[PDB]
Amino acid sequence: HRTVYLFDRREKESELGDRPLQVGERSDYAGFRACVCQTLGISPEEKFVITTTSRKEITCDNFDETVKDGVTLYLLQSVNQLLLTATKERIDFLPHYDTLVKSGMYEYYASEGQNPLPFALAALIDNSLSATSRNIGVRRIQIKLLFDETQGKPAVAVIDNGRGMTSKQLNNWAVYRLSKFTRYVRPVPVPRSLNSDISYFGVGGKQAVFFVGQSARMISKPADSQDVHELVLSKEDFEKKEKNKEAIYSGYIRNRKPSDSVHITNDDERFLHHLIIEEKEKDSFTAVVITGVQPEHIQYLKNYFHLWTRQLAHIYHYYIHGPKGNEINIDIEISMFEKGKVPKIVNLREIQDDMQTLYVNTAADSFEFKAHVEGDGVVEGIIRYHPFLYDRETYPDDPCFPAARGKRPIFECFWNGRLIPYTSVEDFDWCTPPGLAPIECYNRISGALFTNDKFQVSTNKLTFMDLELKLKDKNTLFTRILNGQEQRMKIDREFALWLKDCHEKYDKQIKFTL
Amino acid sequence: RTVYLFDRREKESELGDRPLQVGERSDYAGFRACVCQTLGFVITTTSRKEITCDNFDETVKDGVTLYLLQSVNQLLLTATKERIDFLPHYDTLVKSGMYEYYASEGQNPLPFALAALIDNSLSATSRNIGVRRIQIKLLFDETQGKPAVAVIDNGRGMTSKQLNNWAVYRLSKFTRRPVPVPRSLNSDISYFGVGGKQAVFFVGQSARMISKPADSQDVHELVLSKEDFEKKEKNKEAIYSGYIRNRKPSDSVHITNDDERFLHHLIIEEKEKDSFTAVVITGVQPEHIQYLKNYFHLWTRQLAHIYHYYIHGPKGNENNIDIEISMFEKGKVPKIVNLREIQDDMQTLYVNTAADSFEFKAHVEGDGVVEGIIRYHPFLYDRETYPDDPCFPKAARGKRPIFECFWNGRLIPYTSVEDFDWCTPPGLAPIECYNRISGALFTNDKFQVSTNKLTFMDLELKLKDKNTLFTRILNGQEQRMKIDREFALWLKDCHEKYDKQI
Ligand SMILES: Nc1ncnc2c1ncn2[C@@H]1O[C@H](COP(=O)(O)OP(=O)(O)OP(=O)(O)O)[C@@H](O)[C@H]1O
Ligand SMILES: Nc1ncnc2c1ncn2[C@@H]1O[C@H](COP(=O)(O)OP(=O)(O)OP(=O)(O)O)[C@@H](O)[C@H]1O
Ligand SMILES: [Mg+2]
Ligand SMILES: [Mg+2]
């Protein structure tokens, strides 16, 4: 049985409403037309016509190809009669499954001399940070690059010991654009907004997995749950469901006891048996297993291991090292496996040449402030002084920007504690050179800005929407943070005086002639 | 009301599930009795919450999966399969443009949303015989109802089926290729199946699509709106089901609220058109209205810049496309401009202050070819003529990048290329001549852009790749010279010919 919707539009006064019509398999136009004449009281002496909404007339030849399930049909005196009264033609407009499969394909663009693949990994780290935010003890977040072909096909796995997901929460995860606002306890403010409350849009994890690869296997277990819940979303399963005319967004969660990998029969996915065996220890976990990894991603992760782990340490510097930075707990552990090589392992806390560590440890002093923007948003700011010592500047180098800072921007920008990589602020009026402090001192300052969600970011969290615009608005008030207290100030003069004091206390102009 | 029951008492229990039809008026004991009868403990949800008559109605709903177990916390001997639906949330549409148009390089990004709708009209009018009329009407006169933004073209329009397709997020031309032309001004700008929906839901909260093909006697009208999605959700109706209204041209009887008064004057004009599409955005955010009202000359120049080469052709502003903008305010004269009238958009300034040009192609391994042009702006007696750029308030170009970048003929606003090696100062030509050159790069779709079409994905990285071959185009033939010395020579000639001291 397939339903069609018939509008009688022979005369203006014809019934406004449509008449639905159940049509069984292997029926013909003559049968269809007879029923119409009978129910509606129409002599088979009327020369009326039946047309689609495009005015294509139904005939015996085209009946089966034209009268499909769901179509709307017109009863007309003639094929091109004037539509005296308006019709309502039912439609379905379900999003195409590429809403998921292509959600990350054209989002992570390259900018400022950076490879964006680690930003997809950061999206998954963000999820694990939120999931581990109330852990008693260690918050463990592992990224395993299973690129050893003696264990199966390449796979990227992100595993944490967070709170995990129920069947329902795992169902929610699969819903594109289902966020914490739609499916929530807004956290109490905290310095640098290191609150682990990084989610906003309900899409980031899906963009990441389908950017990295073509199939995601979610494995999760809350502490309360006896059972492990497992859900696969993949390009292959959508294509299969399309070809077989099955519901595109229907599937099933596999519930199972911990450590049971009997459902893994693909030898390509061998490595999953060992991942699933590891579940016995864990009271609560989530594992994101990505397969169908694009070859260009694998080659970058193999050949630039020190660079892209550094990028991640840079992004999560203040989550790793706390609000003061790495003045030289969360364990973010990367491990990569290749045929013929010892496992490569690094805890991001080990990394010492990420840009923030260099800024923090080459700084002689700092200048701390807040910016109060119209709309009640508050930005935390820090400026750091990197002094000239005898014969050299100490402002650290940045490989993306091959006398001290140069033409580089002063400020890196952080949102809920993590770096937003493609938004920098060059300077403000009050920290550019006009004077009361020597000009070259304005080139010795680096900085960081910290917001919470009051300042919007783009969906991919690569950029702020309008951070600089709001900070430089005429109504924005700047305050100084000193000894824990916040106070209004005359910032142009008070920053200059701070800069002059830094020059006199820290800059050293003594050198043996060459 | 169907539930799916898994018998999981023993390791040998039946693997498959047994669907049970639980009537609407049924009890826990009744249900329990039906279970004992059908198969031969406790019953739980998939979270091991035990079914009781206290929770029976809040727990045994249509479509749920249930467990038959010896105890609540018995280990699962055999794995179950729990049916789920995961339809995208309707914010997949309503919020599709809310966090996509970020500000960069001092530009307000609102006109980029209008460019997305212009791109659609360029493609819809690509085979028009005669004029291609693309109108943007800002109906901000409150005597005619609430604010609205309308984009109206005289293109091919949409059938009922094509209008249905337009409402499918991510339904593209690939899941439903012109011949190469200069600067890829091919009007084949679509790719992703989302741009138009991001634009309307960035600008406002409701989109009325009105369309009519020439081969169609009826007009097709479809509304997508935040308010409609919210009503369907409240009433538990299918989220992605609606209807297309089909009507005769110029019939506006369905418009009954005074706040949409303006639509009568808009629909009356359908008499005059064989084919058309009208996008009508309502629920316009107040901040978009304020910007559009107070910076008319700025944001219309932005659109002329973006579409310079579609307006003026492949040589620039030294065609049958009429992009007309009109804004209506209470007690004011209509503001009206054809983008072809604008003369101080950046590309016009580059084209007209240029004394000579240097043309070239970049061949990127993988069949991708980029067309490029560099323009020389001389020093005339006592000033540089390199045009100023309000986004950027070495005396000529200064720190600005050389190259603006175009994709299928239209500007990509947030992708610039500062320079290449062969056109950066080393001296076969005075150093300061290298600061007097602007340029533009043109690609087709062989070079990827992001979904919102604000940036290229990896244009600069591929252009600077060591395998990339740079060839000059002189007259109409490809010359095989070493571009770097060829360009330094061209820059000497330009200096010795166009720079003036007296
Ligand atoms: N590692 C995890 N542990 C527990 N729950 C998770 C994990 N990853 C994802 N989820 C759940 O799935 C949901 C969807 O995640 P996704 O990253 O797609 O969107 P989001 O994080 O909510 O928003 P955003 O788009 O800002 O990332 C999350 O809100 C979270 O509840
Ligand atoms: N003004 C118009 N006239 C005729 N058809 C249109 C018009 N606007 C949109 N369409 C149809 O609706 C479809 C969806 O448009 P939308 O802009 O959402 O995606 P797209 O243009 O296909 O891809 P992209 O995301 O690259 O813009 C278009 O492909 C086109 O077929
Ligand atoms: Mg997320
Ligand atoms: Mg489009």
Author numbering:
A (entry chain A): 25 to 207, 218 to 362, 373 to 446, 464 to 495, 499 to 578
B (entry chain B): 26 to 65, 72 to 207, 220 to 361, 372 to 446, 463 to 495, 499 to 574
What does the paper say about this structure?
Structural maintenance of chromosomes hinge-domain containing protein 1 (SMCHD1), an emerging player in the field of epigenetics, is a unique member of the GHKL superfamily. Originally identified in a mutagenesis screen for novel epigenetic repressors of repeat sequences, SMCHD1 is now known to not only silence repeats but also a subset of autosomal genes, particularly those that are imprinted, mono-allelically expressed, or clustered, and to maintain X-chromosome inactivation. SMCHD1 is a 2005aa protein with an N-terminal functional GHKL-ATPase module (1–578aa), an extended non-conserved middle region of unknown function, and a C-terminal SMC-hinge domain (1616–1963aa) that mediates constitutive dimerization.
The asymmetric unit contains two dimers which adopt similar conformations (RMSD of 0.71 Å over 972 Cαs). ATP bound to the active site is stabilized by interactions with residues from each of these motifs and by an octahedrally coordinated Mg2+ ion that forms interactions with oxygens from each of the three phosphate groups of ATP and with the conserved Asn151 from Motif I on α-helix 4. The proposed catalytic base, Glu147 (mutated to Ala in the crystal structure to inhibit ATP hydrolysis), is also located within Motif I on the same central α-helix as Asn151. The SMCHD1(24–580/E147A) construct forms the canonical GHKL-ATPase dimer with an N-terminal β-strand (110–120aa) “strap” that is swapped between monomers. One unique feature of the N-terminal domain swap in SMCHD1 compared with other GHKL-ATPases is the addition of a UBL domain. SMCHD1 N-terminal dimerization generates a cavity between the transducer domains of the two monomers that is flanked on both sides by a disordered loop (447–463aa).
